[PDB]
Amino acid sequence: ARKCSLTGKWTNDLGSNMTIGAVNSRGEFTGTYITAVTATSNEIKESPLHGTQNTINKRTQPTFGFTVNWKFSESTTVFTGQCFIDRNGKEVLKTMWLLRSSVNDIGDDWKATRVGINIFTRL
Amino acid sequence: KCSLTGKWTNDLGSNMTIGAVNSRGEFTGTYITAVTATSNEIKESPLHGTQNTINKRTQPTFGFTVNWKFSESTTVFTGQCFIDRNGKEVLKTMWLLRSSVNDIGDDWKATRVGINIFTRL
Amino acid sequence: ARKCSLTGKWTNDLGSNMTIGAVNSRGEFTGTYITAVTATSNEIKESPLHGTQNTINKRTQPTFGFTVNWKFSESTTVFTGQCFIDRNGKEVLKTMWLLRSSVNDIGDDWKATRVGINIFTRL
Amino acid sequence: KCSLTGKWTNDLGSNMTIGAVNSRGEFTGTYITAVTATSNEIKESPLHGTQNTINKRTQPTFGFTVNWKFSESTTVFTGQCFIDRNGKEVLKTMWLLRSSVNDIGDDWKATRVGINIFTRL
Ligand SMILES: C[C@@H](OC(=O)N1C(=O)N[C@@H]2[C@@H](CCCCC(=O)O)SC[C@@H]21)c1cc2c(cc1[N+](=O)[O-])OCO2
Ligand SMILES: C[C@@H](OC(=O)N1C(=O)N[C@@H]2[C@@H](CCCCC(=O)O)SC[C@@H]21)c1cc2c(cc1[N+](=O)[O-])OCO2
Ligand SMILES: C[C@@H](OC(=O)N1C(=O)N[C@@H]2[C@@H](CCCCC(=O)O)SC[C@@H]21)c1cc2c(cc1[N+](=O)[O-])OCO2
Ligand SMILES: C[C@@H](OC(=O)N1C(=O)N[C@@H]2[C@@H](CCCCC(=O)O)SC[C@@H]21)c1cc2c(cc1[N+](=O)[O-])OCO2
Ligand SMILES: *[C@@H]1O[C@H](CO)[C@@H](O)[C@H](O)[C@H]1NC(C)=O
Ligand SMILES: *[C@@H]1O[C@H](CO)[C@@H](O)[C@H](O)[C@H]1NC(C)=O
Ligand SMILES: *[C@@H]1O[C@H](CO)[C@@H](O)[C@H](O)[C@H]1NC(C)=O
Ligand SMILES: *[C@@H]1O[C@H](CO)[C@@H](O)[C@H](O)[C@H]1NC(C)=O
Known part of the structure; x- marks a missing residue:
């Protein structure tokens, strides 16, 4: 099997893109x-x-996590998922995410977390 | 003025340390x-x-990834640092726990979800 | 060990309340x-x-699911959890929920779902 | 005009049927x-x-619970019925799968999360 590597430029169906650089010996x-x-x-x-x-x-399909520090919003998104060789032999990232909103009041914390998936392929 | 830096615990008794937050956050x-x-x-x-x-919100949001050293899993946490008028701090977060699965056909069952509330330890 | 039963009036820390009727033989x-x-x-x-x-x-601490059909919004929330006898011998419902907002456009689907917990105790 | 009633499938080939929706929804x-x-x-x-x-929206939200007959688990699904100019419907949902745990101490790990997209027939 290929190793599934995170390093590279990725996109989703929507056409958001993300670029991940080299992965160091600490992961x-x-x-x-x-x-x-x-x-x-x-x-x-x-x-x-x-x-x-x-x-x-050293799994060839490893799990991972990351935090996107949005530069235009007070929110933060975290993604976590796994790098798989897909059925068609291509790498695919299968991820899920939580988008945390900034709220003014601790009484509103309950509504601040949205969840979704995101699936990435190489661009 | 809600700072992430410090030692934190939850009700379960898990602890977390966080270091200085640099100028990039x-x-x-x-x-x-x-x-x-x-x-x-x-x-x-x-x-x-x-x-x-x-x-520069006084009660910022934040995210982090925990790279577990005894599992093939990864957890992410995101939330917000609240600070009351005593200056008591609380981090309210939610997490996703991603397990490693051997086949992509099992991906659907690989992600657990929950909350974790942390106070200063 | 008591059977943990859903039937009854419940509240959470926030003072939201819920009443559950008799559970029938089909559950x-x-x-x-x-x-x-x-x-x-x-x-x-x-x-x-x-x-x-x-x-x-016939577990004494069963899992369960329910949908709240809000009458004042176009939203729906589903809750799922388990009815435990807690360490102190009280019943407790430990649940998580998904709150689905109505969006006007399919392209907004990604952001329509919030997630949380709710812990209920008998009122 | 987006109706739930019908037989539905997803990419995995799970199927679901939903009957008539009464006047209480x-x-x-x-x-x-x-x-x-x-x-x-x-x-x-x-x-x-x-x-x-x-x-009475054309693309209503909805929720449902699946009472699994072969497991002690329960799943809830919630989402929205979308219908295109052509009359083609899709159900975009997310779900929580609650496992049964023996002790309340394990509750934190009992809930998995995911999506499911359904189409007609
Ligand atoms: C599930 C979803 O996820 C994404 O791809 N998403 C993105 O690439 N961007 C949004 C991000 C929000 C950044 C926000 C900063 C802020 O607003 O505070 S986080 C996940 C979501 C997505 C959304 C779509 C879509 C296809 C997909 N998808 O391919 O997974 O088509 C129209 O909207
Ligand atoms: C929701 C729960 O969350 C945690 O604190 N958790 C922990 O501190 N540990 C587990 C972690 C699992 C490490 C695993 C690596 C692997 O297994 O693959 S990730 C979230 C959960 C929690 C449980 C409790 C509690 C308070 C909280 N809380 O505040 O988060 O009191 C009784 O039990
Ligand atoms: C986690 C949270 O959950 C709840 O209690 N929740 C409620 O009782 N209400 C919201 C409901 C929203 C109905 C919405 C219709 C719509 O707006 O579209 S869905 C679950 C959540 C909560 C919030 C609090 C709190 C304690 C808790 N809790 O104990 O879980 O203290 C002050 O705010
Ligand atoms: C995310 C996933 O979800 C499903 O379709 N799911 C199913 O239809 N089956 C599992 C269910 C198992 C219930 C359990 C009883 C028990 O074990 O306790 S609940 C959601 C998930 C899915 C998997 C796929 C797919 C498309 C989708 N989807 O559209 O959601 O294509 C390849 O595999
Ligand atoms: C993603 O990359 C493609 C090709 O480089 C580009 O045409 C598209 O606009 C990019 N998406 C965004 C959101 O910048
Ligand atoms: C957390 O710190 C406390 C006291 O400092 C300690 O007794 C406890 O063992 C720690 N929790 C864990 C899991 O190490
Ligand atoms: C919960 O019920 C108690 C009545 O016992 C009531 O005082 C409290 O306000 C209720 N909460 C709501 C939202 O009605
Ligand atoms: C879904 O329906 C199709 C035929 O209509 C059938 O071939 C398939 O096996 C069904 N899926 C399951 C899981 O029963």
Whole structure:
């Protein structure tokens, strides 16, 4: 089997793109995310992400997580999922995400977390 | 003025340390979990994340990833740092726990979800 | 060990309340929910809920699911959890929920779902 | 005009039928899943839920619970029925799969999360 590697430029059906740089010996990587959609009402900007891939037993399809530090919103998104060789032999990232909104009041914390999936292929 | 830096615990008795948050909002930390979904022995594990600095909010949101050192799994946490008028701090978060599955046909069952509330330890 | 039963009036820390009726032999139940808070700009009203308790292997601490059909918004929330006898011998419902907002456009689907917990105790 | 009533399938080839939706928005249905997290043999299982009828929207939200007949688990699904200019419908949902745990101490790991997209026939 190929190893599924995170390093590279990725896209989803929507056409958001993200670029992940080299993954270091501690499993750390950095990258940038450019979303095609927003919950905000200002200009979208390219935002950094930082995360780690899990290296336990050196799996060829490893899990990973990362945090996107949005540069245009007070929110944060975290993604986690796994790098798979898909049925067609291509790498695919199968992820899920939580988008945390900023709320003014701790009484509103209950409504601040949205959840979804995101599936990425190489661009 | 709600800062992520410090030692934190939850009601379960898991603890977390977080270091200085740099001017880009990056921090690293450790997480020692009281419980695992695994049969392995727990080991303190590193975390890395960022705090959101847009508009220098006093109660910022943030995310981090815990890179478990006794499992093939990864957990992410996101939430917000609340600070009351005593200056008591609370991090209210939700997490996704991603297990490693051997086949892509099992991906659907690989992601668990929950909350974790942390106070200063 | 008591059987943990869904039937009864329940509250959470926030003071939202819920009443669940008799659970039938097919494990169905009906009730009502009054939420203390809301994410819409709308006026809050008591709303019905309908769900089932799982009765496989007649467990004393069953899982269950229910849908709240909000009467004051176009939203729906589903809750699922388990009815435990807690360490102190009280019943407790430990649940998680998904709150589905109505969006006007399919392209907004990605952001229509919030997630949370709710812990109920008998009122 | 987006109606829930019908037989539905997803990319995995799970199927679901939903019957008539009454004037209170209630419906019942069945779910035959292609996959399971369990080691039991899958059996068709009943589902019950409601469609939201406030402002009688063309693309209403709805929820339902699947009462699995081969597991101690329960799944809830919630989402929205979308209908294109052509009359082609799709149900975009997310779900929580609650496992049964023996002790309240394991509750934190009992809830899995996912999506499911259904189409007609
Ligand atoms: C599930 C969804 O996820 C994404 O691809 N998403 C993106 O690429 N961007 C949004 C991001 C929001 C950045 C926000 C900052 C803020 O608003 O605070 S986080 C997940 C979502 C998606 C949305 C779509 C879509 C296809 C997909 N998808 O392919 O997964 O088509 C129209 O909208
Ligand atoms: C919801 C729960 O969350 C946690 O605190 N959790 C932990 O501190 N540990 C587990 C972690 C699992 C490490 C695993 C690596 C692997 O297994 O693959 S991730 C979230 C959960 C929790 C449980 C409790 C509690 C308070 C909280 N809480 O505040 O988060 O009191 C009684 O039990
Ligand atoms: C986690 C949270 O959950 C609830 O209690 N929730 C409620 O009782 N109400 C909201 C409901 C919203 C109905 C919305 C219709 C619409 O807006 O579209 S859905 C579950 C959530 C909660 C919020 C709190 C709190 C304690 C808890 N809790 O104990 O879980 O203290 C002050 O705010
Ligand atoms: C995300 C996933 O979800 C499903 O379709 N699912 C199913 O139809 N079956 C599993 C169910 C198992 C219930 C369990 C009883 C028990 O084990 O306790 S609940 C949701 C999931 C899915 C998987 C796929 C797919 C498309 C989708 N989808 O559209 O959601 O194509 C390849 O595999
Ligand atoms: C993603 O990359 C493609 C090709 O580089 C480009 O045409 C598209 O606009 C990019 N998406 C965004 C949101 O920038
Ligand atoms: C958390 O720290 C406390 C006291 O400092 C300690 O007794 C407890 O063992 C720690 N929890 C874990 C899982 O290490
Ligand atoms: C919960 O019920 C108690 C009545 O016992 C009531 O005082 C409280 O306000 C109720 N909550 C709501 C939202 O009605
Ligand atoms: C779904 O329906 C199709 C035929 O209509 C059938 O071939 C398929 O096996 C069904 N799926 C399951 C899981 O029963």
